[PDB]
Design a protein around this ligand. Structure first.
Ligand SMILES: *[C@@H]1O[C@H](CO)[C@@H](O)[C@H](O)[C@H]1NC(C)=O
Lengths: 49, 49
């Protein structure tokens, strides 16, 4: 059985079993948003999505 | 109306709200090619390779 993975950036829709931790903002936290891993600080965004 | 797409490089302009308001087709004519090379919609007087 050959499992072919396609690793795109935005649309994941397939993630392994992991616990959804509560949101923490306004401090340096290593987030992981559908694989998007990076150290940063969370802030309210006012841009038109 | 029915048209056909082709592989073409484009220069897209994003506004403050992230909506495409203008675009340049690089292969349309030499002026658009110069705009693509300079990565700007405004080109000053001069000679550009
Ligand atoms: C962006 O959206 C805001 C929302 O009110 C608007 O005032 C502004 O004119 C928009 N800018 C555009 C569409 O370039």
């Amino acid at each position: 059985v050959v499992l072919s993975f396609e690793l795109l950036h935005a649309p994941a829709t397939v993630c392994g079993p992991k616990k959804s931790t509560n949101l923490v903002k306004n401090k340096c936290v290593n987030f992981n948003f559908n694989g998007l891993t990076g150290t940063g600080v969370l802030t309210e965004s006012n841009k038109k999505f | 109306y029915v048209g056909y797409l082709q592989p073409r490089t484009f220069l897209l302009k994003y506004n403050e709200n992230g909506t495409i308001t203008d675009a340049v087709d690089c292969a349309l004519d030499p002026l658009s090619e110069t705009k693509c090379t300079l990565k700007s919609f405004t080109v000053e007087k001069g000679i550009y390779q």
